[PDB]
Amino acid sequence: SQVFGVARIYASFNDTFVHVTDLSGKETIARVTGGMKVKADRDESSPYAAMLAAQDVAAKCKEVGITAVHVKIRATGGTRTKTPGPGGQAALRALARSGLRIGRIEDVTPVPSDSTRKKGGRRGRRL
Template identity: 85%
Template structure:
């Protein structure tokens, strides 16, 4: 329904994968969900996977925290790393 990335929220390339960018993206998602009347979410977190890291980075945790602080109810948290 809604997809926002860290790269859409910050100007510098080095900040795209930072927890700050993830927090801004999550706040934007929460705001758009509320305008659509959605107040509960199932969250899927994805790391790079493949030959790279299989664990989600620090941005995943800050994004979840930002969603919870924005008043969204979080149902399931699922890791969908390939």
């Protein structure tokens, strides 16, 4: 029915990326992260920073080739926080709303056979 890509969203704290590439990964198609479409450092990740992301690419997604695409949402994950940076939600809904055709996505962020001890140390980061 439609022509595919890979949507892949990496929503983190104090920024949110959004970029599609070729299904074989190896070849991009347009990015735009949150940190651009707004300027105020802290403001780098808020709801709208996302709907403002997927506006300057979902368009260009719908402008170079892709009419459809599957997403691979990602958290900073790792030895770090591993829990969804809010601005991925407000990005997806903003490419489901882009008219863009959605279908079949899973959780891709890193979760390990735990190791490489976290930073800040045994007393923890304290405040």
